[PDB]
Nucleic acid binder design. Structure first.
Lengths: 43, 48, 110, 120
RNA sequence: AGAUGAUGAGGUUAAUAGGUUCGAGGUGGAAGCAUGGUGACAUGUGGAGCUGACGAAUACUAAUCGAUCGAAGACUUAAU
RNA sequence: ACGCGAGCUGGGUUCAGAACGUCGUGAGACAGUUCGGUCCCUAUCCGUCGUGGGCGUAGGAAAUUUGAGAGGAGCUGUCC
RNA sequence: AUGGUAGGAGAGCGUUCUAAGGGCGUUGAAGCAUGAUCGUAAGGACAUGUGGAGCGCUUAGAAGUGAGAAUGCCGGUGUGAGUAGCGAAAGACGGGUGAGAAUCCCGUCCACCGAUUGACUAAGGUUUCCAGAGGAAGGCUCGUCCGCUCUGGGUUAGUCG
RNA sequence: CCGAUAGUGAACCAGUACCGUGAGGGAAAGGUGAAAAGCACCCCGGAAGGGGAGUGAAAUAGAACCUGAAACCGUGUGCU
RNA sequence: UUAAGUUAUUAAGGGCGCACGGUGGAUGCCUUGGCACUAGAAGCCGAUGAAGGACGUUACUAACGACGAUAUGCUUUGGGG
């Protein structure tokens, strides 16, 4: 049957990914949280 | 489908007394080779 | 005078190897080899290789004559098991059990 | 009669292939049930070949496969031709018989009883 | 006779039991040839296949030499 | 266990939809009707039909029959 | 003359240190785990193993002090069966290769899909592609394949996107 | 004083395996040196053994040289 | 020549003792990473690219350093052998 999660590269870079997170202030807060935790991938 | 009590060691091993292997046949090779299966020219050294 | 050999971490579960190990216990080495040749079980060739290794030990290292030897002890111990997840069912585990097979052979004398 | 673990059509097809390869090769190795069944099939075939006329040649074509045999001195015959030509001449005095079964050990992947069935 | 094992028929004088081959019993009209018909077909040659499951002959068939298992009669006591 | 759903059904009742009568300002109720509506389990310590291997086995041992009961099978009836 | 899950004032032990004293110890000293002693304790002074360099006793003080259950958590371990299952479909024989083949390769015959179990292009996946050689694991076998190893690698546009 | 379920989630491959579309969640695993001196050498089957060999003050001190214990579980002997 | 009594003789199983397995951390160790005191800062950069990374660079190549196409570093002053 059809599942949740049908992947798409452009959509994945467009809702997450660096320039979308830097474009709002709460998004910049997720990148600051992820830096401060020391995550290997920020997005 | 479930057991109410675990079975002990003694009941397990009482169940396994008929669970064993029987001794094979052995009509011996008189011409040449290893001893073969009874009434066979068996595939490893059969000289029946 | 006793020779032995072990085979370690043999990938057969120990319950299946003790069945055919019960056949050859306390018999002569020649008729033990014949019993191991006429059983179709998965572990008769493994055990036969361990038995031939122990007779070779007795002939080469202790200079015993290999026509007087009897199988004094033969046993199987548990080795370390390997845990596998069965994908084929529903996420329940399957252990690959393994065993240690020891054979010791002797001439009955001292 | 035996069913050999097959449906009716599969069983007929397997027995025709078994009998054809025995005519090709004159000893084949198989499991003991199958050879105990192919005894009867190939013995009635050899009977038809000994009888020898057109009607039994047409009866024998109903069972044999259409297989070509590379013969010594580079010739070629079909299996119907080998049956009515060579094999029928060997057994012209013998009344019945014509196949022998010899047992072997178990196979390695099952413990199936192997067997060799041969023409005599 | 049977899930298996058990039961029963039997095994190198041994067909024995099974297969086979010849049989018959029972079940369902050939191929070929000829004749007639323009042809479809019909008729004669005449109860053909089967025997798959229901008698005789056989060694085709196994055990190779096969091998294995299986007593030293209680005692006593008194009643011969 | 109004014997019997780890033997079977799911008509009844009662879960989410919906409607009628009636009550309630209302949300809703009645149990009054009405149509629709998912019932699981590889049998084990165990307790419950059939069929085998052995601890026995007292002369060696083996081939040929007790009948105590543990017993079980209850078998009914209509017209000349 | 001398019981109480709630009660008071009791003598004691495992860890640590003072704060000490005094010992066992590199001709061995342990501790810890297997030994006849002490015992209501909790807790310590002489035969195997260990090693192979760490502990006790006495008095007093301090408590990550204080070990059968909580459908407790898990470093976790291991049991309870040769049971259930092995995921739709037709294979048979001969040859070959090998330490070893119902499985791998070649052959012949048979079979199945055939508006598709065929052939292309997207998305998606990212080296699975191709040769060699061992596969210790992997595959509801074996390797005697790839989806482990080595590279030998391997993707070429003015016009296709 | 943390003495390493630790001041730390992490004194090892750690905000990593992995899980989740994403925000996020989040482990396990630590431990020579006496000196690799790591079984040349040599002998029977690939793995694994049996021998010798060794720097071995000691390999049931063989890659689980932090040694290293227990219990669960084992399994093969036997006394009754 | 009768009546009677009795025991083994398998240990499949039971308890004890023996001996090699699996297991994993009781003992000892560690102190690589922090509780807190003292002192020092100064909180800390850059529109001279600030702020964490991405790709790279060793003769051989798999994560951190250098930071970097001058790349597993370059010059210079002083230590040091």
């Amino acid at each position: 049957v059809k599942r949740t999660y049908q992947p798409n590269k452009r959509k994945h870079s467009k809702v997450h990914g660096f320039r979308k997170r830097m474009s709002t202030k709460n998004g910049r807060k997720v990148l600051a949280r992820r830096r401060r935790k020391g995550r290997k991938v920020l997005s | 489908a479930v057991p109410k009590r675990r079975t002990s060691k003694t009941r397990k091993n009482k169940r396994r007394t008929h669970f064993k292997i029987s001794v094979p046949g052995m009509t011996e090779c008189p011409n040449c080779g290893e001893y073969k299966l009874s009434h066979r020219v068996c595939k490893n050294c059969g000289s029946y | 005078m006793e020779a032995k050999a072990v085979a370690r971490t043999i990938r057969i579960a120990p319950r299946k190897v003790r069945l055919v190990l019960d056949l050859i216990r306390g018999k002569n080495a020649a008729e033990a080899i014949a019993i191991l040749k006429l059983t179709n079980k998965a572990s008769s060739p493994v055990i036969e290789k361990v038995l031939m290794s122990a007779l070779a030990n007795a002939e080469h290292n202790y200079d015993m004559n290999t026509d007087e030897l009897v199988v004094k002890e033969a046993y199987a111990n548990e080795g370390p098991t390997l845990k596998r997840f069965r994908p084929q069912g529903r996420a329940s585990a399957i252990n690959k059990r393994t065993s240690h097979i020891t054979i010791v052979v002797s001439d009955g004398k001292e | 009669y035996r069913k050999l673990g097959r449906t009716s059509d599969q069983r007929k097809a397997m027995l025709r292939d078994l009998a054809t390869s025995l005519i090709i090769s004159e000893r084949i190795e198989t499991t003991e049930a199958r050879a105990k069944e192919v005894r009867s099939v190939v013995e009635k075939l050899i009977t038809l070949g000994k009888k020898g006329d057109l009607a039994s040649r047409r009866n024998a074509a109903k069972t044999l496969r259409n297989v070509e045999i590379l013969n010594e001195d580079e010739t070629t015959q079909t299996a119907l031709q080998k049956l009515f030509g060579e094999i029928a001449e060997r057994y012209t005095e013998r009344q019945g018989g014509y196949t022998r079964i010899l047992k072997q050990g178990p196979r390695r992947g099952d413990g199936a009883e192997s067997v060799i069935i041969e023409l005599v």
